[model samples]
Target chain A: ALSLTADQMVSALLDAEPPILYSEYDPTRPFSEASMMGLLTNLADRELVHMINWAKRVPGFVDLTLHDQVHLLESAWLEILMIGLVWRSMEHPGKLLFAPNLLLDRNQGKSVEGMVEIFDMLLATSSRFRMMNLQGEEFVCLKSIILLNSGVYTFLSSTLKSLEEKDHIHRVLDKITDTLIHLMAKAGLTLQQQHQRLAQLLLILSHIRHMSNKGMEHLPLYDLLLEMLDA
Target chain B: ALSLTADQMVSALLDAEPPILYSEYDPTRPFSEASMMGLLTNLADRELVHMINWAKRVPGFVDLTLHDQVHLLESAWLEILMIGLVWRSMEHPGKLLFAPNLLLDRNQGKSVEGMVEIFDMLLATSSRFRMMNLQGEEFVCLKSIILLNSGVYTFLSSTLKSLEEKDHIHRVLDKITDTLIHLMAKAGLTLQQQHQRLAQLLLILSHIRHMSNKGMEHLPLYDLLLEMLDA
Candidate 1:
């Protein structure tokens, strides 16, 4: 029954935004493609900690076996990385606002091995974010929903086979979806607008999945997460 | 030095374009959203058949178990569907040419549930294809690489755990890479340009993945595929 106006919702999301998750990168600095990787590595570390804490707090996530926990964490990590990336840069379209000083575009490392492709996909993903004009609450809920899904397709090798486990995952997603629906209602939009906004929010996960799969092809960032999970 | 000119590469890829893929859908037809799903179902059938033929004709594809074959097939199907969609409409931009008569835009389904998100992604993807000005040879090779992706993260569930299967997949990719490299040489691309183009093509797969994922959230098209795959 409690509804926060759009401004209150935005303030809450900003309040929750992990401190300095978006660092400043000096585009003018003499950085190699290697440097970009280094920056991403640092950012990924912060995101890893953030996601771990978030996952741990989620009601039944800790109850899963270590293998299940690791698999889901590994799979969902990149999705959250992307969600963070988009959330940080949503206010500034086109260029990636790494830190206050580091503004990056696709052309930043045009010759870097995977830079062009990553940048291209990043730009495309950002444009979608801009088009949606998503509020902070929507973005936060979307990340929760994405992180909740046991996303690793091949990582666990079908380990979570029990009907109980399946229901458990379903329940978690259902709970998150319910919260998102509640948030939509609280945003004080018309019923029809809420319906469309909620749908748009959920659909963004597909982009996260896409980014994850695409990351599978290359990027030490993804490889590091998988290896980190194994460790 | 059997370098074919760029013209030669274009001709080779165009030669493989199937005639039945792009039918003309009437834009003015009073079609329901369900009708759009039906059209996609029809298109997916054609792409499945085409991809099967392509994979079987590949030298080592038949050597895999039917399980492996089916897994890879299902995994790579959407990437190819995307390739086909972009390829079919490459000559024309801004609209999806679903059928000869049925050109689609986001505005067309503005009122349709889930149609806006799907169309938004579809249009974004189409624009990427357009921006790349991809050549026919590139499109064909991209599809092959996507199709042969050692795919099926969820379906096989760790069935392909052996080192030998991994090497086999590696060898298949190597052969295709060799062919593509030779094609690039023939087409007279500098080594740098070839490398960049190859990277661009692989990265596009992420977009396809995103589009497919988004489709799964609410679209009838993806629901149908899930049901069919289960059956």
Candidate 2:
């Protein structure tokens, strides 16, 4: 594909309606458990479809063995989902933008079993991203880097092949990071500010990794993402 | 190259013996900055040697172009170091175990710059591993999985190669994870407990990744590792 708008790439990779909490319920009201599950199911399914498609779109990903594809998806799917959540939450400052109908503050999500802990991290992460004012280009690049992690054997079975694939990934990563750096320069960041910004953004990846791991344990919705991919 | 004894594998992969701090030094004594650097240099070097050796041991790693090797090393070394730290810490309870002579109770390490934050996470992680009573076999398997992570593209030079390698990794990971389950059974864990333990271990991997990322920024010794690798 030709160089395209970052939004175009995001939309192509991610195709979900703004997740709806209820078909005909108050956006301001607490959702019933059934409605909550339905909303989660909708969000997980849509995000996962995008996650899978995005993985496949990386150049030459389809040529890997079936086992490899599944492993990569399993390893990466959660990280992708977490970032998408961050991206959505970034749209509104204090509230989590779950969908058109479901906007949640931390207290709002407190009714569910594990939702409080998960949403707390999400809210904190979302706030950081908003504070950073992360750009669309940077977001896509960050998302790409997170999901393409192959530092482990499960990431790729053949060591020789793993090295070759990583070389390609490095080039793309460098390219994107360079572009991000240039954009920061255009946006009036000094060299020092740019360095700090870049490091901080990478720092958020660590937070996302930690929070998502925690989320998988506490959130029933995550298991559904795994099932969606499995099916 | 059939599987070596886990001890044999660890010894071969990790040539460094258990590091010994000054036999005369007090565990309660705060070393000067120079000694701290010395200890860090000692710790960093041993862990780094293993990381380099371990990466080479993977099938066909040497066949990769030199640049690819360095990139993979750079990407994984910190994660490897963090796992090594966890493994060492797991051997004891409630303290950050360094060399036999170098054990630091949390309060002991609290005085240095950034030491407080790093130790807080490490202590918390150590407690979790202690709580789980993570076994040596499980520890090695988990370490391998952490460093060999292939969910990111920078791990390999080509996308197709990563998939093929990821395929191999998944099988190995499953085999070991299965072994871990059996080990848990032998240890008399309930089915639910076994699941929780496995999930918790993986969850710890994410924490290691995050802590290691932070460590890289704040810990001068990590830069020292990079320098050693570069040399």
- RMSD each, Å: 21.7, 19.2
Candidate 2 lDDT, B62-160, residue by residue in tens: 444444456556656767766766668776765776666677776766667778777767776776577567777677666655544523223322367
User: After superposing the true interface residues, what Cα RMSD does each candidate give?
Assistant: 18.8, 17.4
Residue A19: error of model 2 in Å?
10
Number of colliding residue pairs in each model: 14, 37
TM-score, candidate number 2: 0.47
Question: What is candidate 2's local distance difference test score?
Answer: 0.58
After TM-score superposition, the amount by which residue A210's alpha carbon in candidate 1 deviates from its true location, in angstroms, is: 1.1
Residue B47: error of model 2 in Å?
15
Q: Is model 2 an incorrect, acceptable, medium or high docking prediction?
A: incorrect
Candidate 2, A1-231: lDDT as tens digits: 225343444454344222323334455764555466456666766657656656666533455544455655666677777787778789786688766666777677766777777777777778667756888767876676565442222331236875565444444444445545565677898754554455446546756776666665664444544454444
**Candidate 2: residue B77 Cα off by (Å):** 18
